[model samples]
Target: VLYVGSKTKEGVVHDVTTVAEKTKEQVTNVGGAVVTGVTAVAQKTVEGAGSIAAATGFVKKD
Candidate 1:
């Protein structure tokens, strides 16, 4: 299992843990195993939000 931290326009990162849980559960629930990798996907949706405003970085992995 791996932990992924994701967010939208931050106030505090709401549903990040929920997102991670759902992602893990959904993946495992669908019988697909998951693994860890540091992926940086540059998105156009966050292009004007400035550097730290987008879906950036992770905290931990399990």
Candidate 2:
């Protein structure tokens, strides 16, 4: 599961596509800029640690 802000309505259902699109947009907005540390890893560790670092926001250079 992923973290999301609390919804406004206590009992209202949410649109999955809208959330998906919004989430995708946010990630896309960061683009390659948020992944700088991925390039600093040793090639052997790239496939594993790179993604973990990115997901944890450790790769954001600025």
Candidate 3:
């Protein structure tokens, strides 16, 4: 996700490390969001499965 552009008189001014660091920051943020969503879905799935089992008398009630 890097873009390189040029100007007529300004030549090229850029920092490779800066671009890399920015990319890493963005990727990590996106990754965290994905992990959170997956975890929530898994938790809900477990809860739903337990409810189904209990309702169907597959699990004994206390």
Better by TM-score, candidate 2 or 1: 1
In the predicted model 3, the residue pairs found to clash are none
Off by over 4 Å in 2: 1-8, 18-62
Candidate 1 per-residue lDDT over residues 1-62, each given as its tens digit: 66479545533322333234435433332334354544444444444444454343333343
Clashes of each: 0, 0, 0
lDDT of all predictions: 0.42, 0.38, 0.31
Stretches of model 1 off by over 4 angstroms after superposition: 1-30, 46-62
Best by TM-score: 1
Q: Any idea what lDDT model 1 has?
A: 0.42
Worst 10 residues of 2 by lDDT: 36-45
Better of 2 and 3 by lDDT: 2
Tell me the lDDT of model 2 at 31.
Answer: 46
TM-scores, one per candidate: 0.20, 0.13, 0.11
How far in Å is the alpha carbon of 50 misplaced in model 1? Answer: 24
CA lDDT, candidate 1, residue 61? 41
* lDDT value, residue 26 of candidate 1: 33
